Design an enzyme around this catalytic site. Structure first.
Site, short mmCIF file in Angstrom:
data_model
loop_
_atom_site.label_atom_id
_atom_site.label_comp_id
_atom_site.label_asym_id
_atom_site.label_seq_id
_atom_site.Cartn_x
_atom_site.Cartn_y
_atom_site.Cartn_z
N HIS A 150 -24.89 -36.81 -13.18
CA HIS A 150 -24.80 -37.20 -14.58
C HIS A 150 -25.11 -36.07 -15.56
CE1 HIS A 150 -26.36 -38.78 -18.37
NE2 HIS A 150 -25.54 -39.80 -18.20
N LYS B 181 0.82 -1.20 0.00
CA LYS B 181 0.00 0.00 0.00
C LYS B 181 0.86 1.27 0.00
CE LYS B 181 -3.72 -0.79 1.95
NZ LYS B 181 -4.78 -1.16 2.93
N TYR C 236 0.91 -30.60 -28.03
CA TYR C 236 -0.48 -30.17 -28.09
C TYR C 236 -1.36 -30.66 -26.94
CZ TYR C 236 -1.51 -34.92 -29.50
OH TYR C 236 -1.62 -36.29 -29.47
N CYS D 281 -5.07 -35.71 -24.03
CA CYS D 281 -6.49 -35.65 -24.36
C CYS D 281 -7.32 -35.84 -23.10
CB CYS D 281 -6.84 -36.76 -25.35
SG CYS D 281 -5.85 -36.74 -26.85
N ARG E 35 -13.42 -41.05 -30.22
CA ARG E 35 -13.70 -42.31 -29.52
C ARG E 35 -14.64 -43.27 -30.26
NH1 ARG E 35 -12.66 -39.00 -24.09
NH2 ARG E 35 -13.80 -37.31 -25.15
N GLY F 194 -3.36 -39.82 -21.41
CA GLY F 194 -4.69 -40.03 -20.84
C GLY F 194 -4.55 -39.84 -19.33
N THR F 195 -4.32 -38.59 -19.00
CA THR F 195 -4.08 -38.13 -17.62
C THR F 195 -5.23 -38.47 -16.67
OG1 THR F 195 -4.93 -35.97 -18.31
CG2 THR F 195 -2.56 -36.18 -18.24
N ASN F 196 -6.42 -38.66 -17.20
CA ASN F 196 -7.58 -39.00 -16.35
C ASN F 196 -7.41 -40.40 -15.77
OD1 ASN F 196 -10.78 -40.19 -16.28
ND2 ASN F 196 -10.44 -38.23 -15.33
N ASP F 197 -7.04 -41.30 -16.67
CA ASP F 197 -6.83 -42.71 -16.32
C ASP F 197 -5.46 -42.88 -15.65
OD1 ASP F 197 -9.28 -43.74 -17.11
OD2 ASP F 197 -8.57 -44.54 -19.07
N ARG G 105 -9.13 -43.36 -31.85
CA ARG G 105 -8.73 -44.38 -30.87
C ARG G 105 -9.55 -45.65 -31.10
NH1 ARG G 105 -9.64 -42.84 -24.65
NH2 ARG G 105 -11.77 -43.49 -25.14
N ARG H 46 -3.55 3.48 8.51
CA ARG H 46 -3.66 2.13 7.94
C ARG H 46 -2.33 1.39 8.08
NH1 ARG H 46 -7.01 5.18 4.33
NH2 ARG H 46 -9.07 4.27 4.06
N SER I 38 -0.21 -39.88 -26.70
CA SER I 38 -1.46 -39.23 -26.30
C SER I 38 -1.76 -39.59 -24.85
CB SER I 38 -2.61 -39.69 -27.20
OG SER I 38 -2.79 -38.76 -28.26
N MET J 220 -3.78 -4.21 12.06
CA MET J 220 -4.72 -3.23 12.59
C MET J 220 -5.71 -2.75 11.55
SD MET J 220 -4.10 0.51 14.37
CE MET J 220 -4.62 0.17 16.03
N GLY K 137 -4.92 -10.05 10.38
CA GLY K 137 -4.59 -9.76 11.76
C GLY K 137 -3.93 -8.42 11.98
N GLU L 130 -1.37 -44.03 -20.56
CA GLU L 130 -2.26 -43.87 -19.41
C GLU L 130 -1.95 -44.86 -18.29
OE1 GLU L 130 -6.32 -44.96 -20.64
OE2 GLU L 130 -5.50 -45.77 -22.49
N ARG M 143 -8.25 0.63 -8.15
CA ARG M 143 -7.91 -0.78 -8.32
C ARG M 143 -8.38 -1.21 -9.71
NH1 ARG M 143 -12.66 -3.36 -4.37
NH2 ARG M 143 -14.41 -2.64 -5.68
MG LIG Z 1 -8.42 -44.84 -21.03
#
Ligand SMILES: [Mg+2]
Ligand SMILES: [Mg+2]
Lengths: 874, 874
Positions: free
Chosen positions: A456, A25, A854, A834, A562, A769-772, A619, A95, A767, A106, A104, A748, A338
């Site tokens: 869902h 400030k 990518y 992906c 898919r 498959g970070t989810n799996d 795939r 201030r 490719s 003043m 915390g 994956e 701001r």
């Molecule tokens: Mg899979």
């Protein structure tokens, strides 16, 4: 000045870079004053002064006070007002503020410098009612924050006043009542502290300064620095600034504005002004503000200064500003400034305009539009949403952003019927199951009764960028009577209903939907985004239409098509897969497989036609075969299977049991299935190349890519790749023509990352498959961990849900390792990802830094990925 | 000699170390001859000669032939017999042989050197029938292997002979018939080749040599070297050795023996001798062999030489030998020698005796007993299994080794009843389910109808080292009539039945079970094993009895005591867990939890009592809660749940649905459950420490360890560890006594291995769960991958099932990484592994080399782990 730095319009001892000493400030004040802003004069006592203070046993270090006095005199000379002088009064604000945010500390103390005489001298131009009310508040504030006197002690006095006078809304007390209250409040000091309220302004200042220094060592401040690892800091600074008022006659006033329209981006001051009064008045119903013109009218000299201050703000900070200002007797004063919040629409226009005005370059404009801003422009939105406040009959969860307007229906079948006639339907159901997908897709909006942000309907709707209001408890769908009661209201099939997926609002009737944009600014903005990013952004799509939607959103191809989704597209196709599964002989099995061939060949032709010119990565069959079986009681599954395939009750049951699994996520699926039943992969490969050729003969440019899923060894991949290449050559020989294509794999399985170098000898692209990969790396069954993730997040065990935000420390390490090893083996190996992580900003930034080529996400997340891929490099 | 090396009794040009040039067989011959063995004289043509041959366009290199002639003359002088001389005939054998095993090489050619005259000169002492039969065979052998003449061409002639004479078993042809056949065979050469059979012995030799050289480049030999990556080799060698016969009168004979009893290990020559005849005779029914004494009797001079040859063999090769020898007219000849196969019993005794005889030291004796040998001594075995050949009424799969004798029963309940009376029962059921576990455990043997090596009965039985014959198709169990038809035979409840789990044999009646050992040799052998190994070997046990069995098998403690197994121990305990799960209020939930406390506290006291003096590592509740629910139709699960807990139909169904999961392997279980319901972990921790204290007050030494399962972050572990330590201190304060204990974690999630350094700050030990680690690393659901593992193994995609043999390249890499990172953070971190990999030899060897501190496996696998942990260092 080494421990105290003053500042004023065009004057400052410190500068914008002294965040350490002056504090955030304090440094910003110096910066504001340094560029010519009309900020009230004041000074800052360094954080070093606080450290010296604490070390000297929380005592004021030698010479400091001398400097503080030096600074106020400067402020007094600057303002032409003296501290503790009733004729030309000077009130101060105190201030705190360290280098970084810090709780915390003043709380702000306003009007320091008051006493009986100064209070009367203030009532002179500002009035008695205000002067004594401010005095009452200051005694309480100063008393509690600086003298550590319990607030209850003061409210204890005020309550009795109205309890005897006859009110509860203080705005009802009189000047004399407040004068009397001032007397009672001063007695509190005597009763609680043992000494009277310090009437000497300089004593107040000193105590205020020490109180701020002391604030640095407050419980919450210490916890934060130990419950949020921090060190070095060294203390807090104190910012003392002259108070200013806008209730000193009809030559004064207070106002607030945005240097540009926060809703549309129009380059015009947007705000309001209140003549002779302060912000408080409005809150009580005491005063009603006008528009900025009233200021230009009644105070042209101050308004002109306001415009110069605004241009200086934008010119120096390169950003639209939200400000609070006060005009004290024709003199303009800049208080708080701001970066202004705004809609996406406004964000994009302001960013583009600032580039055209030559205020900023593209690289900086890119950072002015947050992912959250860009997303608002990717979905439909209501024109004037405020005008429907009375038509709102319910509020559910904002499961999926965007506005939707259509006729209510209660079955997926009816939403499909509506879509087939080119009409808008709002699908209203208790909850959704995979059986409503077709209708959910056909509707312009979905509304459910049960289920939260992870139900869902919510999940599927977000995947399509489709408006969805979830878990709306205040609704009851009467399937039998074709109606739904929403908040006691009855809506029958065919009636209009509006939905705002961003707020969860259920609006009765058909609200106007904002007309499409014509500006051209988003196109301009996105061109700079696409110039800067290095990562390519692809889309995950399984139908020609989604492929088209992805392309209109800027996708550079399809990173994941898919094939199983193509079979789930219709009952006829699903029945065909079931026939293959139940075929009692190899001849009928091949006959069923052949039917799957036209379906596949036909869909790829349409997909290839839509992506004309761009790579399309397909795939191979991913799910276990039981996912294609009907659901329900075992009796009905059997009955249905026999009726659809010809199998008898015996063989139907046996086969269902054989296809049953304990953990379907990690069983007989993907390449395991394509390896054990090679005919499956030969059928899909055949369909891919024949479709590719057939479109190439029509002038379409096809760049087919085949992805092998769930590989854990180079042998699994080599087996499938060999099969794919044999089919390619047979097809090319039969057709008499050859085209280029690539074969790759989805990474994956953790083991695949460990032996990535060997897998790269067979794969031309990776490719992720970070989810799996996340599922297997964390040992988390996404469908089942919802039962304890919330607990983990609340207890600090997890920082984020790993399925939404890529776990950079764990999963990310396997991603980096696989990328590096794969590329050492095959230097030009294309590596990508992906999944939803491919559309999540922080994850995309990681992928960019990790060196991937990518990311591939849902069609409507594509522009977000593009934006994030640019911002990480800027 | 540079390309040809001769050899004989006490004479050899080459030595045992020339495997490269002389080849394995050639080098061993040199070695045998070099130590004084009575091996017939011969010579070896180096592998370098073969290479020169191939390079010179498959032509015989200069000078080689001159050397070959030089070598045979030496052999002729050594034997006092000349090649191609009817009066003092010399026949040769020609064999190939490279440095390493190599298929596609020329098959052995016996009796080279024959012709019309030599054939008659041979009939002199050996007889006409044999001489001409050998000539017939040689013409065929030499003709096909050296002259590349189709065998069919010869058999085409022989068949006609018996087809006209009137026989099919050649042993029926006469001397004249064979003489006539010799004539017909020679015509084959003329018809197929265009030239007559080479009657000149030296021509035969030359062609034989070239044929062997040519054999190196045979299709199968090339495939093997390219379908089993190999190089350098450089070619094959040729071993020419003088033929010898034992049918030259009653002063000759052939025999075979083991230098020691292959069944018991007794240090005595074990074999048989056949006077005046050859091995062939026995095979036809022509002759019947006697015992070795007949040799000592009729040929003392040769027998004495045989004994010296045997002592020399054991003295030099430090191993019991299986040999083939021939006595030609009082002269002993050592033919083939190889390490003798033997039973485990024999293996251990021989190893110990050789150490006591001062022939070998412990370090070498350790390598003389294979895991397979040691395992035979860990299970019960039949005395004379040959005597029951007629009582065998069926053969099923040898699902689990060991002999069992008991009365047939058809229910787990009856096997339990039999066990409670201290009686032996054989449980016979169609197949088993987790409901029969109690009875399966109570029986001395299990027999099922359906299921293979991986069925429920096989797996469980192997885990207990219990005899089990699986998938015995020839049986039908009549539950209703209390009987079972086995191979048409009827066995009723109570009748005796015998089982051999090692062969899969189902023997009628009660066969004798070999009395326990008294020797003391296994104790001696195992002491050397325990001295050499560095790894500690612990056992996985959940009951006091298994803990005792583990200790008697040498376990140094319990590395994994599974608390969920303790609840599955009885219906009452299971019902108690269900009550906790269905409790409608926190008060009844705590009430149910308290009941679980005594059960737990009671079992640990017994386990601690049994492991008095040794560490006992207890793992917290591992499975998802639905694993404790009854199985079957949803209707029955509900009915049963309401009857057992008091829940109504509504709440029962709701809760079952809430506990249902898609992938139970990776859901709401382990620390996720202990973290979300801390009371569960407080209850188990309480039970552990109270039990530990209660036994310590009775003089028992307790070293309790608590293992937190399924951890993927240091936060999950820290949460549980904090809870465990708080309970420890409360209990110690209440009891007024404190004891030492450790807290650790199971490493089974890939991510845990990635952040192992942080997890080590909370854990005092690492317990690798390679089974689950393999599941997550491979993305293999063990319960479901059985459907394609066989295909993967047959197609070379997998070398071994990763769940049986640790995947060193993938899973092992995470194990090494976790061990290294954990130890850098906590230098003295104890690291081990619990699971079947901890009892599998190749896996144990890896763990030892990876630097782990210990392995923990099933009680009966403990001695195997111990053995393997020693052999890897030897
Ligand atoms: Mg899979
Ligand atoms: Mg586990």
């Amino acid at each position: 000045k080494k421990r105290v730095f003053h500042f004023g319009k065009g004057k400052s001892e410190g500068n914008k870079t002294m965040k350490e000493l002056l504090g955030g400030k304090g440094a910003n004040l110096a910066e504001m004053a340094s560029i010519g802003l009309s900020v009230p004069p004041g000074f800052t006592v360094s954080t070093e002064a606080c450290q010296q203070y604490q070390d000297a046993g929380c005592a004021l270090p030698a010479g400091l006070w001398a400097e503080i006095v030096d600074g106020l005199q400067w402020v007094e000379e600057y303002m032409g007002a003296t501290l503790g002088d009733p004729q030309r009064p000077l009130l101060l604000s105190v201030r705190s503020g360290a280098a970084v945010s810090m709780p915390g500390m003043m709380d702000t103390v306003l009007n320091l410098g008051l006493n009986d005489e100064v209070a009367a001298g203030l009532a002179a131009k500002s009035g008695e009612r205000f002067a004594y009310d401010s005095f009452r508040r200051f005694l309480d504030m100063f008393g509690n924050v600086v003298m550590d006197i319990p607030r209850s002690l003061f409210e204890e006095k005020l309550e009795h006043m109205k309890e005897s006078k006859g009110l509860k809304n203080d705005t009802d007390l009189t000047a004399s009542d407040l004068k009397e209250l001032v007397g009672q409040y001063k007695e509190v000091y005597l009763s609680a502290k043992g000494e009277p309220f310090p009437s000497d302004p300089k004593k107040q200042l000193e105590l205020a300064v020490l109180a701020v220094f002391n604030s640095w060592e407050s419980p919450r401040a210490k916890k934060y620095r130990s419950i949020n690892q921090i060190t070095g800091l060294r203390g807090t600074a104190v910012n003392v600034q002259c108070m200013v008022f806008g209730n000193m006659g009809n030559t004064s006033g207070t106002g607030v504005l945005f240097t540009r329209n926060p809703n549309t981006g129009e380059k015009k001051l947007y705000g309001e002004f209140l003549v002779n009064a302060q912000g408080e008045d409005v809150v009580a119903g005491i005063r009603t503000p006008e528009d900025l013109d009233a200021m230009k009218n009644l105070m042209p000299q101050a308004y002109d200064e306001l415009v110069e201050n605004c241009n200086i703000l934008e010119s120096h900070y390169k950003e639209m500003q939200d400000i609070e200002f006060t005009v004290q007797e024709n003199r303009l004063w800049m208080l708080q400034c701001r970066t202004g919040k705004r809609t996406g629409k406004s964000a994009v226009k302001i960013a583009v305009d600032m580039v055209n005005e030559g205020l900023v370059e593209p690289r900086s404009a890119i950072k002015m539009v947050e992912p959250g801003h860009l997303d608002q422009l990717l979905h439909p939105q209501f024109e004037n949403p405020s005008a429907y406040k009375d038509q709102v009959i319910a509020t559910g969860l904002p499961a999926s952003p965007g506005a939707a307007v259509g006729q209510v229906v209660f079955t997926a079948e009816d939403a499909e019927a509506w879509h087939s006639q080119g009409k808008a339907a709002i699908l209203v159901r208790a909850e959704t199951s995979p059986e409503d997908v077709g209708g959910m897709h056909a509707a312009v909006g979905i509304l459910t009764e049960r289920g939260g942000m992870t139900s869902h309907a919510a999940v599927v709707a977000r995947g399509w960028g489709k408006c969805c209001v979830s878990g709306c408890s205040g609704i009851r769908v009467n399937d039998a009577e074709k109606l739904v009661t929403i908040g006691g209201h009855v809506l029958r099939e065919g009636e209009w209903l509006s939905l705002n997926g961003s707020t969860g609002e259920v609006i009765l009737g058909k609200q106007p939907l904002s007309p499409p944009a014509l500006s051209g600014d988003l196109g301009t903005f996105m061109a700079w985004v696409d110039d800067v990013r290095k990562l390519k952004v692809l889309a995950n799509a399984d139908t020609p239409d989604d492929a088209l939607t992805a392309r209109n959103n800027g996708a550079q191809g399809i990173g994941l098509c898919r094939t199983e989704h193509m079979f789930f597209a219709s009952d006829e196709r699903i029945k065909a897969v079931r026939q293959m599964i139940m075929a009692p002989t190899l001849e009928l099995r091949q006959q069923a497989l052949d039917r799957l061939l036209p379906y596949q060949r036909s869909d790829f032709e349409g997909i290839f036609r839509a992506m004309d010119g761009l790579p399309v990565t397909i795939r191979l069959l991913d799910p276990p075969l039981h996912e294609f079986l009907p659901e329900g009681n075992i009796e009905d599954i059997v009955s249905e299977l026999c009726a659809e395939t010809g199998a008898n009750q015996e063989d139907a049951l046996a086969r269902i049991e054989k296809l049953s699994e304990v953990n379907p996520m990690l069983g007989f699926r993907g390449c395991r299935l394509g390896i054990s039943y090679p005919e499956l992969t030969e059928m899909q490969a055949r369909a891919i190349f024949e479709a590719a050729i057939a479109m190439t003969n029509q002038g379409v440019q096809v760049f087919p890519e085949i992805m092998v899923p769930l590989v854990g060894t180079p042998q699994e991949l080599g087996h499938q790749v060999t099969l794919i290449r044999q089919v390619a050559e047979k097809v090319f020989a039969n057709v008499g023509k050859t085209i280029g294509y690539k074969v790759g794999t989805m990474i994956e399985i953790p083991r695949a990352a460990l032996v990535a170098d060997e897998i790269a000898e067979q794969a031309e692209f990776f490719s992720f498959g970070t989810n799996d990969l996340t599922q297997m790396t964390f040992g988390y069954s996404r469908d089942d961990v919802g039962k304890f993730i919330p607990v983990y997040l609340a207890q600090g065990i997890l920082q984020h849900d790993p399925f939404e935000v890529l776990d950079q420390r764990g999963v990310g390490e396997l991603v980096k390792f696989a990328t590096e090893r794969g590329r050492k083996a095959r230097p030009n190996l294309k590596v990508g990802i992906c999944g939803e992580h491919g559309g999540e900003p922080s994850s995309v930034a990681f992928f960019a830094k990790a060196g991937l080529d990518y990311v591939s996400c849902s069609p409507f997340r594509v522009p977000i990925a593009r934006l994030a891929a640019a911002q990480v490099l800027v």
